[PDB]
Amino acid sequence: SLASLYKNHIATLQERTRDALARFKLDALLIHSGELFNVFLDDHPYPFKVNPQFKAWVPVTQVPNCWLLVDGVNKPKLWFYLPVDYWHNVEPLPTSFWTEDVEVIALPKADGIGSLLPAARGNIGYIGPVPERALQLGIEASNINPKGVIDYLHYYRSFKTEYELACMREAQKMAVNGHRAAEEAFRSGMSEFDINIAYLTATGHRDTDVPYSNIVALNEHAAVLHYTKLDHQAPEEMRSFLLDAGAEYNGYAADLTRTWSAKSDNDYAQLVKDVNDEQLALIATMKAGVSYVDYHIQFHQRIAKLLRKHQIITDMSEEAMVENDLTGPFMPHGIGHPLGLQVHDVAGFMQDDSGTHLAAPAKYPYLRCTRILQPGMVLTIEPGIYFIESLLAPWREGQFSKHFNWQKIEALKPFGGIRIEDNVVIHENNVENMTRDLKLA
Amino acid sequence: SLASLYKNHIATLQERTRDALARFKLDALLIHSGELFNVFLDDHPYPFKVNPQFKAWVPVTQVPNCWLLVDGVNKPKLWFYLPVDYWHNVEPLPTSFWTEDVEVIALPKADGIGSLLPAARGNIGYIGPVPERALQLGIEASNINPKGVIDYLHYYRSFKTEYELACMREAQKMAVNGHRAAEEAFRSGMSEFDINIAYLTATGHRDTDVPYSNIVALNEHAAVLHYTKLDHQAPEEMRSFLLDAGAEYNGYAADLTRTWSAKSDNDYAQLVKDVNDEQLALIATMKAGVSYVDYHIQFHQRIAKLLRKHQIITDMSEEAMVENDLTGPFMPHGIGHPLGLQVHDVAGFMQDDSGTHLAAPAKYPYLRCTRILQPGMVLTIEPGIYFIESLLAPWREGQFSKHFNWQKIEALKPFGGIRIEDNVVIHENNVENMTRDLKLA
Ligand SMILES: [Mg+2]
Ligand SMILES: [Mg+2]
Ligand SMILES: [Mg+2]
Ligand SMILES: [Mg+2]
Numbered sequence A, B: 001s002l003a004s005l006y007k008n009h010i011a012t013l014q015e016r017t018r019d020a021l022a023r024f025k026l027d028a029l030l031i032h033s034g035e036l037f038n039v040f041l042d043d044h045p046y047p048f049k050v051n052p053q054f055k056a057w058v059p060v061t062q063v064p065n066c067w068l069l070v071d072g073v074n075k076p077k078l079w080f081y082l083p084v085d086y087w088h089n090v091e092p093l094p095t096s097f098w099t100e101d102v103e104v105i106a107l108p109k110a111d112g113i114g115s116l117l118p119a120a121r122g123n124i125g126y127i128g129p130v131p132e133r134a135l136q137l138g139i140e141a142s143n144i145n146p147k148g149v150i151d152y153l154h155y156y157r158s159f160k161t162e163y164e165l166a167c168m169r170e171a172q173k174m175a176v177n178g179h180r181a182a183e184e185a186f187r188s189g190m191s192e193f194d195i196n197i198a199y200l201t202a203t204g205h206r207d208t209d210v211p212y213s214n215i216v217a218l219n220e221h222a223a224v225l226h227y228t229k230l231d232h233q234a235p236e237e238m239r240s241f242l243l244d245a246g247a248e249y250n251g252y253a254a255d256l257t258r259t260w261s262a263k264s265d266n267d268y269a270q271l272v273k274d275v276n277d278e279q280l281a282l283i284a285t286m287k288a289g290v291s292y293v294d295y296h297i298q299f300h301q302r303i304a305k306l307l308r309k310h311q312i313i314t315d316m317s318e319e320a321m322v323e324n325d326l327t328g329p330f331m332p333h334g335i336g337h338p339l340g341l342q343v344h345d346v347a348g349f350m351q352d353d354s355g356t357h358l359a360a361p362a363k364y365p366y367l368r369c370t371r372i373l374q375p376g377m378v379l380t381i382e383p384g385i386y387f388i389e390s391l392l393a394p395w396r397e398g399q400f401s402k403h404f405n406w407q408k409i410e411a412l413k414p415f416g417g418i419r420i421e422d423n424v425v426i427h428e429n430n431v432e433n434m435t436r437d438l439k440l441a
Helices: A002-024 A131-136 A147-157 A162-187 A192-203 A219-223 A267-285 A292-309 A318-323 A389-397 A406-415 B002-023 B110-115 B131-136 B147-157 B162-187 B192-203 B219-223 B267-285 B292-309 B318-323 B389-397 B406-415
Strands: A028-032 A067-070 A077-081 A103-107 A124-127 A215-218 A240-249 A252-261 A378-381 A384-386 A417-419 A422-426 A431-433 B028-032 B067-070 B077-081 B103-107 B124-127 B215-218 B240-249 B252-261 B378-381 B384-386 B417-419 B422-426 B431-433
Touching (some): A002 A162, A124 A147, A162 A192, A162 A252, A162 A422, A192 A215, A192 A240, A215 A219, A240 A417, A252 A417, A267 A384, A267 A417, A292 A318, B002 B028, B002 B162, B028 B131, B162 B192, B162 B252, B192 B240, B219 B406, B240 B417, B252 B267, B267 B292, B267 B406, B267 B417, B267 B422, B292 B384, B389 B406
Parallel strands (some): A028 A124, B028 B124, B077 B103
Antiparallel strands (some): A240 A252, A422 A431, B028 B067, B378 B422, B384 B417
16 A cells, blocks of 8 residues: 555656656756764764655665665666664665665665766756765766756645655654653643653654654743753643644654643633634635635634634724734744645745745745645644733834733733644645544644 | 852963964954754754864853854953844843853844954954854954864863863763663663663753763674664563763763673673773773873783683683784774763874874774873773674684684674773872762672
8 A cells, every 4th residue: 555655656756857857958866865974073973864855755864875866767776875884783775665666776885876876977966965975976066956956846845645645644643642642741740851751752753853853842931932942840830831743754744733731720721722723713714726825814813813802902803903913923923834854844935846936925924835725735734822022012012002901911921822733634625634633632 | 169160261271272372373263152054955953063162161052153252361252142033042141150251242143243353353263163154254264273273272172170070070970870770771671762761861861962872782782883773672682781871061071881781690791790890900000191002902901811711712822812913803992082072072192282193003993092191181991892793703714713712702792792981080190980989880
């Protein structure tokens, strides 16, 4: 099943590659997995992060010095770095399903790749993180990471193959398990550090191989959007927990966010439940052929609803709240973004395979996606509401200050904020919510 | 007390810097903490690894875009990157023990540094991982990471101040706690992954912030010198555990290795005990004024003694065993190296402040230290005995094959290997074993 899906994946990628080579007048693409490099003045290596364009073809993510030659017609060729040394642990020559559709060739020495490459290299496009290596290998200067080919392929990354979707559902499983374990850790009164430990234990991940840094935010930290630190002692009293964490399977990411209240009978808990319901309703409105921006704006309308309902903003209609941008400081980020091999996946602004860029509207400058919904797309939906003094301050001084319930805002600050993130897949007649299909409350 | 020590530290570094600047004809050093950089084609950042030369002055290890300006006479100036935006964690400048000896100035934008630096930059030497940024700031290309100054400073990093020693002792405490918890995990039959969890829990480290990747090796994996993988299921039969792991405090590293046998009554357990005792005896022989190579060779003699005692190598004297290099494949690495801000600390081969280089002897090409011991040096002592087929097998094709007890070697291979590592401080008339002072058995 997964194997046959992978045969389709290879066929799709071969077609895209063939079209790209035809358009940009190239013979083939040489895709480099990457190389190790050390910290300044030290021999301490940075962790290896594989070229996304490399793992786009094959599930090999932990091996540098690998090389993929593709022409869209012949069987893809993979030179797989296989050093023989007693120092390091070395990955064996892979023989999994994918090796049936990809010709795997052992590469004992990294500098042995040059003699194995095609004789004529003048029309080969190199894609990889080491341009100097490409130049050494006889790749023409302009064929080193050519932006036209890269943009083309990125545009087509927007549309996931069935194999990719299967991989992403598998990542969803791991992330869900992690989130449940983390919630249990929170309920037990554990610190952010220990909660993180519980998440990693449940997922089988290390902090060095999660698709992105975990956000384990207790209380006020929930209002901190890029919170990546971990307190080693639990707060004096538990109030709230925002967890933005995910997982990875065959290079494909899940990226989930859940928010919990320590108590269930306060304003904050009610607000969390409301954000949940609004998120689900928004998703229920989603369909192909509609701009993603529409859904961003839509959630700002829902924010206006919640602000009015909870008496956070008073003496103003929801419509006027949106018109005057009062909802702006409460969700100062976008409703979400494409998801795939990368967490913030490529082509979020790209309208065609020629690289046409459509920026976010000035009113919502941090929106990461301006794409028309089409079947095959995988997108995050991550609405939130936060109470951030630096953003609220100018409002307190301005003409709309009287509309803000500063007392209640102060009362909500110690709870930080709320975000609820699912990952969905656009289909012809519906939207598949992978996260909720796994019943993550 | 740490404040007073730090004041002394500042005085020391000031004088070193003054002398270096006078010698290599510069007015000041501009030392850059570093910059974030992302994965190829992604917005996923690599973990931040501070410039060792930067944390050499101040205990700031997690903040990019910081700049130290030092002339060796006036109070050190530190522009501390302190951005004001509703993302990540917002807080004021540090007011810790070190902020009275250094002038700390908030830097809200990374590109604002250039207008805050002295106008005359023709004689300012840049030290940092971003030469391009130095060029942008008008630093002469020949003054970007100047070899003379860097080598000089590296040479003097060999001699730790009292502040540095204190920090290293704290790191020792952390690491010792980790090793104890890890041994306990091992005895309980836990997988490498769970043992690593236990280590991280006891030290309070993350995999992303350990000074070097943990080596958690069960059974045969102990024969793999750089084993940084983790099995998630415990092996069928527990036989051995080699743990090479450490900790960091104020940017200063501890690096410890311990080896345990599942059973206490077999040959392997006895060999582990013997290696431990021989390590301790070697350390008991250590003296200032003596070459480190002497101690490397000495431990090869001790290895010869053990191999003879255990009937692993037969019918050859210890002296002849060393002369013919039969002990070679049993410890294919150095006896140790300088330790400090970096794990493999600097100036290991550097004989003077002019950068004179003394290579390891050809017989022991992987020895990382050729220094004469002097008071204030911190060194690792990490002897080991391993059973590595790729290194042992060729001896069967040679004239000394008859001296190898291949049967016993075959019996010992399932246990992998043994390494016992302590971190020691050289003093005038004694050697301080920080690790054993903490009673890590
Ligand atoms: Mg997220
Ligand atoms: Mg997201
Ligand atoms: Mg060491
Ligand atoms: Mg070590």
